[PDB]
Ligand binder design. Structure first.
Ligand SMILES: *C(=N)[C@H](C[C@@H]1CCNC1=O)NC(=O)[C@@H]1[C@@H]2[C@H](CN1C(=O)[C@@H](NC(=O)C(F)(F)F)C(C)(C)C)C2(C)C
Ligand SMILES: *C(=N)[C@H](C[C@@H]1CCNC1=O)NC(=O)[C@@H]1[C@@H]2[C@H](CN1C(=O)[C@@H](NC(=O)C(F)(F)F)C(C)(C)C)C2(C)C
Lengths: 306, 306
C-alpha cells in the first residue's frame, strides 16, 4: 500500500565516508579498504578551479599535504595517484567497515540513492535517476563534492556516482568511481550546459503499473497498440523510444497486474495526447519517470538487504 | 542547488532493527539497550486480529514463545510486558549499537524518516509527515509492522513512530514508541476511516521559500496581506490557519530570502485563488506541504549528523 520515492538504507555507505582536507579546501571521500576516493579538485584553490592543470597541481603535493579525518581518528596518507577526475589516497589503515562493494557505470534512466555529505558527515539520503542528457536532478550545497551514489544488492554496495559540480538550470554532474564523467562535462569552473533532456518512457510505464497496483486505475482504456504506433506518438512529446528490451524489462509488472505492456502503452498514448483532465495519478499531476521497473517491483514486493 | 524529499541517514536505526517471531507471526522490532519494542499484534493469529483480546493472548505466552533474531544471533527473551499497543521484550544481551536516543510524540505537520523493514532487515528509507488527521502517507507491505519513524538531532535518534496498519484510501496509522496510537485508531482488523485531511499551510510557505532560494520566483507578487485576510482565504480551500507561532517558525526563511512572511502569504493567496496557470514550482504542478520550515533550512543550509 502506498508508493514513495524510496532510497536504499544508507548505513553501509555511512561507515565509508571521511573528510578529506588539502590545505584550505575540504570535501568528502569514500574510504574502502586502505584507499580513500575523492574528487581531484580538492587540491585546487578557488583561483585554480577556473582553469586547473590537475597534473601540475598534484606534482607539488606530497602525502603530507592531505589530511583524512574518519570520525575522531586522523588517517596517515602514504600514497596518492590520479585516475581521471578522482583522486585516490592510500592510507595506513584499512576501513574495518568496508562492505562488499563494486564500482559500476550506470546507464541513463537507471536510478540510485545519493548520500549527501558535508565535512565527511552524512546529512541526508534521496533517490535520483541518471537523465538521458547524463545529468542528475540532485540536491547539493557547497562542500558536498565527494558524496556518492549507490545501489544495494543484498549485501553488496554498487557505487556508481561521485558528485563534482552543478550546472546551469540547477542540474548536477559527476563521475563514476573511476573518475570518468557522465556526459561531456569537465571539472572546470567554466560555462557548460547539458543537452536537452528526455522523458524515460519505460520508467513512466513502470510508474503507471505502480498506480494500478495501488488501485489508481482511471487511465486504463480498452485499447491496445503496436510498438511502432506508440513510439511515433511518444517522439512528438520528447519521450524516448520504447525498445523490445524495455518491454522485456516490464514483464514482471505485466505479470503481476495482468495488463499487457502494449495495453498499458495504449493508456500512456491517450494520456500524452489528451492530458490528464485535471486528475492525478499516485497523487501527482505530472507523469513520473524516475522509478525503474525494478524499483516498482522492489517497492511493490518488498526486497530487503543485509 | 536543487530540492528533494530528503530522509535522514538511516545507519543508526539500521543497527537497532531485529526480527521478532511469535509462533507463526513475524514482524520487526526495535532493539535498544536490552529491550526489544514491537507491535503487540505479533502474538495474534490471523483469526485473532479480527477482534483480539491482547491481554488474554499475552497471558498464555511465556518468554520462550518469542524468538528474536538479530543478524545470525538469536537473543534469549527473559521478560515481557505490554505498554499500550507496543510489546516490550527484555533480552539477555544489550544492543552494543544502541545510539543515543529519545522517545518523542510528534505533532501533526511535522516530518520524519521511515525505515521500512521486513523480517528484521532494512529495505528502504523515505520521508513522511504526520497529517492533520493523524495518518501518514507511507509505503508499506505485509510484514512491515515494527518499522519505525525517526528524526536525527546530531547524534541523537528521536523515535516518534512505529507502524501498525493501513487504512482505507491507502493511508497508514501507527503509534509512538510508548504504544499510544496517533489518532483515534485501534489495532484491530475492523472497518475504520480517517477524518478529512487538511493542507499544512506553514509547510507550503516553507516550500515556497525553498522555491525562491532555488531561483523559482514567478509566483512572487508586489502585494502584502494581513494574517486575518490570508487565513480567511485559506479556510475556503481546506488550508489550516496560520498562527503567530507558524510565522515565528518561518522567520529563518524570511531572513535568508529577504521576503517577509506576509508577503509570501500574499503570493500563496493569489496561487490559491487563481491557480498555477499551467506552471510548475520546483518541478511540481501541485503545492507541496510535507516540508517543514526546519527541513527547508536543513536542506538549504546543510546540517550534518554523526
Ligand atoms: C563540491 N563541493 C561543489 C558542489 C557544488 C557547489 C554548489 N552546488 C554544487 O553542486 N562543486 C563545485 O563547486 C564545482 C567544481 C568547480 C566549480 N564547481 C561548480 O559546480 C561550478 N559550476 C560550473 O562551473 C558549471 F557552470 F560548469 F556548472 C559553480 C559555478 C561554482 C557552481 C569544479 C572543479 C568544476
Ligand atoms: C504489519 N505487518 C501490517 C502492515 C499492513 C499490511 C499491508 N499494508 C500495511 O500497512 N499491519 C496489519 O496487517 C494490520 C494489523 C491487523 C490488520 N492490519 C491492517 O492494516 C488491516 N487494516 C484494517 O483493518 C483497517 F481497515 F482498520 F485499516 C488490513 C485490512 C489487513 C489491511 C492489525 C492488528 C490492526
Amino acid at each position: 500500500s502506498g508508493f514513495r520515492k524510496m532510497a536504499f538504507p544508507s548505513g553501509k555507505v555511512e561507515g565509508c565516508m571521511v573528510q578529506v582536507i588539502c590545505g584550505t579546501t575540504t570535501l568528502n571521500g569514500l574510504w574502502l579498504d586502505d584507499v580513500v576516493y575523492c574528487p581531484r579538485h580538492v587540491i585546487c584553490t578557488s583561483e585554480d578551479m577556473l582553469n586547473p592543470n590537475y597534473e601540475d597541481l598534484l606534482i607539488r603535493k606530497s602525502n603530507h599535504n592531505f589530511l583524512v579525518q574518519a570520525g575522531n581518528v586522523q588517517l596517515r596518507v602514504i600514497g596518492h595517484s590520479m585516475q581521471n577526475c578522482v583522486l585516490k589516497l592510500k592510507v595506513d589503515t584499512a576501513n574495518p567497515k568496508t562492505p562488499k562493494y563494486v564500482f559500476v557505470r550506470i546507464q541513463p534512466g537507471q536510478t540510485f540513492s545519493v548520500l549527501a555529505c558535508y565535512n565527511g558527515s552524512p546529512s541526508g539520503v534521496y533517490q535520483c535517476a541518471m537523465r538521458p542528457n547524463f545529468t542528475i536532478k540532485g540536491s547539493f550545497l557547497n562542500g558536498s563534492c565527494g558524496s556518492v551514489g549507490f545501489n544495494i544488492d543484498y549485501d553488496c554496495v554498487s557505487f556508481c556516482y561521485m558528485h563534482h559540480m552543478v550546472l546551469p538550470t540547477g542540474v548536477h554532474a559527476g563521475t563514476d568511481l573511476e573518475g570518468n564523467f557522465y556526459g561531456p562535462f569537465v571539472d572546470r569552473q567554466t560555462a557548460q550546459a547539458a543537452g536537452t533532456d528526455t522523458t524515460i518512457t519505460v520508467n513512466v510505464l513502470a510508474w503507471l503499473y505502480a498506480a494500478v497496483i495501488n488501485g489508481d486505475r482511471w487511465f486504463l482504456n480498452r485499447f491496445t497498440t503496436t510498438l511502432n504506433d506508440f513510439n511515433l506518438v511518444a517522439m512528438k512529446y520528447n519521450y524516448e523510444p520504447l525498445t523490445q528490451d524495455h518491454v522485456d524489462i516490464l514483464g514482471p509488472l505485466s505479470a503481476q497486474t495482468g495488463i499487457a505492456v502494449l495495453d498499458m502503452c495504449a493508456s500512456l498514448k491517450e494520456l500524452l495526447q489528451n492530458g490528464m483532465n485535471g486528475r492525478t495519478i499516485l497523487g501527482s499531476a505530472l507523469l513520473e519517470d524516475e522509478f525503474t521497473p525494478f524499483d516498482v517491483v522492489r517497492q511493490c514486493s518488498g526486497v530487503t538487504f543485509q
